[PDB]
Structures are given as structure tokens and as C-alpha cells.
Amino acid sequence: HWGYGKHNGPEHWHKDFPIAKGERQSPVDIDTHTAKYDPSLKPLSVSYDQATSLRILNNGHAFNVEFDDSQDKAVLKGGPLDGTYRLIQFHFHWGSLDGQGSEHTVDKKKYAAELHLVHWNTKYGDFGKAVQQPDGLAVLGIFLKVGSAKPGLQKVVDVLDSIKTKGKSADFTNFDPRGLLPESLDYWTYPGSLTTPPLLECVTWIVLKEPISVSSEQVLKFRKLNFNGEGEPEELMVDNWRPAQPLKNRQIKASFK
Ligand SMILES: [Zn+2]
Numbered sequence: 001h002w003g004y005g006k007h008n009g010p011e012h013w014h015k016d017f018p019i020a021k022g023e024r025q026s027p028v029d030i031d032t033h034t035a036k037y038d039p040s041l042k043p044l045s046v047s048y049d050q051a052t053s054l055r056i057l058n059n060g061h062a063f064n065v066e067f068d069d070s071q072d073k074a075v076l077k078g079g080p081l082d083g084t085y086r087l088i089q090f091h092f093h094w095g096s097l098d099g100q101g102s103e104h105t106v107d108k109k110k111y112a113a114e115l116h117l118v119h120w121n122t123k124y125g126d127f128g129k130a131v132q133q134p135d136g137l138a139v140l141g142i143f144l145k146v147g148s149a150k151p152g153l154q155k156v157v158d159v160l161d162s163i164k165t166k167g168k169s170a171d172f173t174n175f176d177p178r179g180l181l182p183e184s185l186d187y188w189t190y191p192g193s194l195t196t197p198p199l200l201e202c203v204t205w206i207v208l209k210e211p212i213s214v215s216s217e218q219v220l221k222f223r224k225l226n227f228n229g230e231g232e233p234e235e236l237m238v239d240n241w242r243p244a245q246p247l248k249n250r251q252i253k254a255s256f257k
Contacts (some may be wrong), residue, residue, distance in 0.1 A: 002197045003061070003227065005235075010242050017199050024201045025245035026192030027103035030252055035188060038253040044185045044206065045078030046140075046178075051087065053175035056159055060166035060227055061196060062091040062240055065156065065175060069120070069127070074177070076119045076138050079206060079255065080189045085119035085138040088127055090177060092116070093195070094222045096238040098146045103195050103241045104207055106143075111211060112219055113144035114241070115180060116195075134191070136202040142182065143211035150214050152179020157221045165230040182210035186256040195242045209256065 002008055002016060014020040051074035055066045066089050067074055074087035094113040095101025102111035117140040120130035130136035155175060162170040186209045193201045225237035 004240050013197060013199065017197055019193070019199050019201065022193065022199070022201055023248050024191050024193060024250060025199065026195050026203065026205060027105075027242060027244055028190065028192065028247050028250075028252070029105045029108060029244045030188050030207065032107055035252045035254040037257045038255070041080055041189070041253060041255045042078050043255070044076070044187060046076060046181070046185070048074045048087070048176070048178045050074065051175075051177055053172050053177075055169050056156070056163055056172040057169040058163040058166055058225060058237075060229075062093065062237075063160070063163060063225065064089045064091045065172060065177075072122070076117075076140065076206075079187065080204060080253070081138055082135070084122045086122055087117060087119050087177070090115060090117040090180075092144070092222065093241040094144075094219060094238070095241065096223065096236075098216070098219070100239070101241055102143055104141055104143070105244055111143040112146050113214070113222070115142040115144065115212075116140070117142075117177065131194075131198075131200045131202050133202055135204065136200075137194075138204050138206060141205060141207040142180065143208070144214050144219070145211045146216050146219060147213040148215065149218055150180070150212055152176070153214060153218055157218050160221050160225060164224070165226045165228060165232075167229055180212065182208055182212050184208070184210045186210065186254075188252050188254055190250055190252045192250075 052068040076085040102114040124130040227235040
């Protein structure tokens, strides 16, 4: 089965998933001097005030915070999107050291971690159908740098002990994802794919320019999770990031000059 190890890592995924070497794969390096400022791009519209979080799950490849997506409660609208996208889950990718961990890079610079808030397009009625369409998903990417602590992330960090191994889940109600956003909503946008198996090319990527700060202690807690199940040899959940993929015939547009 696929993973991030020496024998089942990113460079092996193409054997089981032939879309790994596709025309619009993610992540990519964001060349800030080559990105095209587009004045037709509208501001992002994030409406998370009615968000309803339910559970936190260790799925073996990261931890996911899941949300009730049965109604328009937490939606992403605006920017380069047409229609309403509902929040279904968020997760992180992080490193073994502070100098790596993000999937995206900015002028080849790696950040300590990257947060992905995953949304699906409501005209296709369920997440399962949205992943089979080219405009099916909208993912909000936010870079994490080590420096001051993020008060709004501690609730997530404190529960990691309860979901140490693959398959473990815990009740996680009343979590507000508005505590993880940066001050500015300026962003880069490009058409891409999921950064993990089945690597479907159904994502409009929205990467924020401003990163958020987390403490060494906070990111250290992420590094104590396990890829393995309970009663199995301990393999620390670290370096769960896919390296940059070629841009090919794609243009990165920026919302700011
Ligand atoms: Zn991700």
C-alpha cells in the first residue's frame, strides 16, 4: 500500500496510480516573479460562522478534522470559483525538521507545515461525484512557520494523544476553523490535483500568501503521531508531503500586485 517511506513513497505512486505523471499534478513551486497579476479575480468569501465539526481521525497518512457537509453551513465562495463549495475536512502535511514539511514552495522556500481546508462543489451533490469533475474541489492551502504560538490551534494539538495510531478517532465538536486563518486573504490560484492517492485532477488550488505562526512545541506534538496501527511496530508520522511536480502548460495567477 502507498505511503511516504523509502519503498512506497512519492516516487513509487505512478505504478498504482498512472495519473501521478499527469498534465495537472500538485503541489508546484510558485515562482513569484512569473505569477501573473489578474485584476478580474474577485476577493475570497469565507463563511465559516455556522461550521459544525464532528470528529478527528488518524487515517494512517495524516489526521483529518471532519465537518457536517449535509447543509450550506461552512462555505467557500468568490475568488476564481463559480458556485458554492462546502467544507468537508481539513488536515496538515509536516516535516521531521523545521526546514521542510510544506507541499507547496514559494521561490523554492519550504515551510514547516501546510494546512489544507478541502471543499466540494454543491452542484454535483456529494463529495464522491465532485472528485470526478475538473471543477469539483476547491482546497485552501495555508503555510505554517515556526515562531509565536497560534492560540486557535491548541485545541487540535491537545487531542492528538487520543488518536496516536491509524484507525483511532475521537469526538471533536464546536471547533471554529476561523482561528487558523491569517490576517490577509491575498492568494495564488492554479488548476491542479489531490496531493495523495487517487491523485484526481479535480482541484482549483487557492494558496494564501501570508503564513501563520505556530510554536516549536505545537509542531513537535504533530511529530508524535504514528503511521502504524495499535500493536504494530512504531513508525513516527513525519515527512508526509509530496515534492513539487512540473507546472507543464499551466499559469499561476495572483490576486495581488
Ligand atoms: Zn493535503
